[PDB]
């Protein structure tokens, strides 16, 4: 009847952990969950109840774009603007779109 905590999703009729960030589902509890770590050029941040991890962000200098941060298992990559552009479309730290000057 009652919902489970935070670190956990539901699975049938129970309530399993879910994998840190960085981990992936491998497989649901039955004991808790076997969280195992995400693949290569992918990532995700928060505690997990997914089989999935999240594709990294890829930075296209063709469009002036220059990874800022890079992608690893527990945060995504963020992307600047290569010299002589400046930033036009935002989201808090990921440049979108740039603007030759």
């Known amino acids: 009847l009652p919902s489970c905590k935070e670190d956990e999703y539901p699975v049938g009729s129970e309530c399993c952990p879910k994998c840190s960030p960085g981990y992936r589902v491998k497989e649901a509890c039955g004991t808790g969950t076997v969280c195992e770590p995400c693949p290569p050029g992918t990532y995700i941040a928060h ?3 997914l089989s999935k991890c999240l ?3 890829m930075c296209d200098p063709a469009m002036g774009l220059r990874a800022s941060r890079n992608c690893s298992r527990t945060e995504n990559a963020v992307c600047g ?4 552009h400046f930033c036009i479309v935002q989201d808090g730290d990921h440049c979108a779109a740039c603007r030759a000057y």
């Open 81 to 84: 603007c290569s010299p002589g």
């Open 55 to 57: 594709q990294c962000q």
């Open 47 to 49: 505690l997990n109840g």
